[PDB]
Design a protein around this ligand. Structure first.
Ligand code: NA
Length: 97
């Protein structure tokens, strides 16, 4: 068996074909096992509506998840990604910078 803690990166992106749109992204990479729970947060509250969740694997024991959705951030709101995995004794929260 093998278990690897996921790398977690939170960032925003504007699709070039529609610059006005902004998307909040949580890229969870290189983890194993595949079982996982991931949420985007807005001011500590779970965002129920997340339009995209793309899962893939490279080696049979390495998974990747891109979890993102459109959003409209303001200088007053705080965004983050919360991840729960067997390798994390406590859920890991990575804030969006
Ligand atoms: Na855990």
């Amino acid at each position: 068996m093998i278990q690897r803690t996921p790398k977690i990166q939170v960032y925003s992106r504007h699709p070039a074909e529609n610059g006005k749109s902004n998307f909040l992204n949580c890229y969870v990479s290189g983890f194993h096992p595949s079982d996982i729970e991931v949420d985007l947060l807005k001011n500590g509250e779970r965002i129920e509506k997340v339009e995209h969740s793309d899962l893939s694997f490279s080696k049979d024991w390495s998974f990747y998840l891109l979890y993102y959705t459109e959003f409209t951030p303001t200088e007053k709101d705080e965004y983050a990604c919360r991840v729960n995995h067997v390798t994390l004794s406590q859920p890991k929260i990575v804030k969006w910078d």
